[PDB]
């Protein structure tokens, strides 16, 4: 009759942490195969039956909206990494679930959670110090122009792809499109449009805005196409 | 098609029993073959990887599966080696026959065809051998 | 001591054997982990303290790094067994590792059971 | 079929028989209340993934927020929760002291009742030990606040209260709250937490926060006016939008030209409405909801400073300070109900413009801490540290007496009370000794939350106290279960925090022990 | 939200389940391939009744609620604008490649590795087709054989009664809107 | 593929690699379990007589042909 | 006419005008400007475009190919190619990608954990093994054998390797620094910090509370 | 297949032999060292032989399982050869199986595990011999 909970579901101790560790691995499995350029795609269907195919880890987590409490922590952390950077959400999501998996058997053996936190806070700072000590600055290495090194980095992602035979042309289109912008660079600014048919090398790079122009109404031999 | 009479169920019954004997003895092939645990009815237990000893201590009851056991004895008398390789080859051919029979090929056509591969097979091994 | 050496030796071979030699290294720690539990002490800390004094012996041979440090059960602290006189025969640790390895090999090869 | 339930005749309530120990059951409801907050005790307290009634996720370790969200239905637990609410009066800390200590008194009382000691004799021992504890607690006073109004002094003592609410960032928060508290202590005999307000703004991190005078509001000034010294501030709850007439006011429009005529008539009316604001000698206006586009230019026409306060608590905050009350009509020229202020201006701090109500002409005894954080849940948890931190020094305006923390007083006060029970003959010694062991639960909470064998902490804390080394507490460290001096480290607790906590905790425990049967009723 | 009753299946059990759906769409159309193909009786939502063997019409009416099967239909929507004829050949070949892939998943091949293998073989096939190709109207604009070849394919449909008159009409139309020299017909 | 599996190798890539070495080379290419990988078996001196491989295909195929010819089994008494 | 709103709004930010629905408010306030406009003949169809706009912080890249999957697969790879070039110019300090830095930290933390007596030894080592997942899944997703690569990769770092990592193209290890497979060091630093801070929030939690609603 | 017995294959057979050897180790795990705890031995009649010696336990320990009997036959080899270290053998062998069984779940073949453990024992005996102290 007189109980304390009366609907208030609550559990504490080691079983709660282990339950959250397993729930976090589910979010990892949802974005485990999408790591890298050649990662497997993921098909997502909304309520209306509309399909969504994408191998981007950030876009996948936005569409899931998992209701588990522990899973929301990773999603909000990964979402913040997407807003601040736009890349690395999968690495953050996988490492977090993997830090939780490796300390899982020690948590079951009676190791306190707070001792585990001192290790991550300690190992993290040592890792961040090792990155800066071993990292290398590359601005004018080998007296090569930046337009050439950036071409190598561009074709690297495009290597052994469907445009591998003509990636020299496509590699220059990336460096050209980025160099056209001002100091404030952003991915959304540089748009892309698709035109079926024709050779791969015929891909054009308009400096301004471009569109198909399906307008085929009357008006020819008038309406001068050039304006100052 | 109706396929009222189903005598093919006995082929799949003999192939499954024949393939079962091969699937067990498969892992024990070679020097690095995984050992197997045999337990006598009295209570004794033993460990071995010799495929010949495992087939004898299997107590095979199916007729088709017994043909693989008697087949392995024929290899021991004739050659004395490759006892385990024979049962593995027969199990895979019958497993391959399960795909051909589903396509509507008769066992007699499959039987006569395998003899032609055996005839050409012996020529392949004999040509590449070292006298 | 073998927990650090075999873990470093595993990185030299590879070829689907780096993990097995590493797990062989981690498996030996059960002995100091079990002796610590029986001595009413924190096994996670004492096992970690042994591997630290033994790992420092591998980094450099300088005398500041302690060497051949054992485990004292009463005081619940590592101690140099050369001074404490906690010695064992060599054939014990050699045969026990050999016989234990042959036993796990004999069981790992068992992938099936047939009853009659 | 007989024999049915025994001692069940009042609405069929669950009446525990003599074998079922009805008193033992009300205690178990209080022990479960402690376990929900025993882990959140100390600087290494564990956070609680609290789910609000609005299905909102919040991760916090504050005791008052846990109980406010945890619907405690058992009455035996409500009494201890009522002591926590009474703990908030006269002091703003020591809440978990009431939960952990009272839970130990009741948990240890079961060991006495199981032996056969009467509940009325257990109460007499706790009342005697509580009276004895109040005599020993002044003798444990190590230091006392100099009252020099020094930020170096106020920030140093404030570090202990900030920790266990927001650990790690106790340096920044101690300096900021010290700068806010020191600026009001000159107002002798009038310090209160209501003056030191808090304004959270989405920002980079906690390090980007600062203190500013006057009632700061995060919403920048919508109008084009930079500064205005007008006293009359007109507050309206109704937003600037299309007017509606309280009478019939039937508006019929058929043609398109008539639509434009009525539209022009509304703009001419709104131009007269904002004209009335300046006619009443008020160049400032506040709005709750949206603000219209044409009315915005009218605010810049007469140079009327436009102000937007979407939060309701922000509006009521001004109603009780300047006096400007919100009226239901849209711009009624009611000059009588307007406010009074010495200075109103905009200021950019941390790359964000915020409205300010500074008191330049008047002396000024109001401040505000502008917190910055990249998460709303994080700033809210930091706000709870400000209340528990500011209220710590609202108590120091009273008798300035500090005692050691980290479980140091709990062992010495237990050691002094245990000796009193050993030499006191009779049956009261059993409950007096257990009153001392109840204090040991607090060091046991700090040790368990830090990952340390609690029995080893009690063994060491008693040895150093046996040698007379008072002011020794638990050294918060994962890999070091030893102890250290709380005086040298600077960890200090408040006297009145322990006084009112030991008092209210004992009354809550005694009030639960005095109850032996819960009975339903009907009006 | 709505995590309850959420679909959850992955690994080989999911790929084989996806392959099982594509095979049903292929086996349904494998019989309707060619002039001797078996027709399909389609009943419309309005109660109508129609019978045909057109691969495109079969897929448009086939409202398969499985998502993997919908992609097979979206593929054929584009094929009608490029190939026109072998709409059943695409679906029948896809079902064959997925059926043979199921034998590879048991051997332990990854799906992405099979994807790379078929892409390599598809290039070998496309390279071989040009070798065994032949021209018709090379270096000359002619209308006689252009009427002949198009007339053969039309003989399978209901235009067989007057198939010859349709082929001459399809030539003058394309010849009118487009020029055989530019070779860019719209 | 069974020998490669027992030797810790990949059953597919081992026979898939050897089928290319046999198209280009000879029968010397085979699995060497002593070293744990593909090697030239002619150099390792790991050989068997011809009768083992010939009698295996001969007797195994005759058993498969015999089992294939079984239409049904009759229980006598 | 018949211009998509995205292209119009892309030209809005490029020209600096405003898309006004009704034609009654059209005036100089909403009208845009440009330097050179010309109608071209890309692939036979006409493509309008304003070049040298006042707020010309945008552009467009028209793709060509034999099908949509040639362009869609090309569309995915170019968007990251823009980010790679966008990253190298911003941050000059970089580290080897493909999990090369993750294996170096695994060597440093693991060798450091041995010198740390206490319970932190097993945990800092556990932190090191957790970094293996980044080069591991790149091998598993690429269809390679993670065992043969990770063992061959972890062995190279011990002998002196610091930039060797996973090569998604060839099933072998490669010097990702010499191969110009780079990533920003500060972006990788923020990944470890957000990872540990995210794991610490879950590890520091011990109980969940739920108001009945 | 029809037979006059029973068969059971798969990875679970390794796990069943792993959990069996792990069980036999836990019977002599807490009794390791000179401060080892005593343990009862309820015979079939009802006698109770209380002792902490690991060798005396395994001689009297009767667990009708094949994998456990392998470790019992293993105990006789160590007792006759040396006469000590039998308890550490059963405990070391149990952890190698519990760890190897985890590798088998990571698609590591037992032959690759058997090869690693053989080389580790060889190098371990080398490092031991290089770090002795003569009598």
Author numbering:
A (entry chain H): 6 to 233
B (entry chain d): 24 to 154
C (entry chain a): 418 to 533
D (entry chain Q): 7 to 529
E (entry chain E): 18 to 203
F (entry chain d): 463 to 539
G (entry chain H): 312 to 524
H (entry chain a): 5 to 139
Question: What's the paper's own text on this?
Answer:
The eukaryotic chaperonin TRiC/CCT assists the folding of about 10% of cytosolic proteins through an ATP-driven conformational cycle, and the essential cytoskeleton protein tubulin is the obligate substrate of TRiC. TRiC is the most complex chaperone system identified to date. It has a double-ring structure, and each ring consists of eight paralogous subunits (denoted as CCT1–CCT8) arranged in a specific order. Each TRiC subunit consists of three domains: the substrate-recognition apical domain (A domain) and the ATP-binding equatorial domain (E domain) linked by the intermediate domain (I domain). Here, we present an ensemble of cryo-EM structures of endogenous human TRiC throughout its ATPase cycle, with three of them revealing endogenously engaged tubulin in different folding stages.
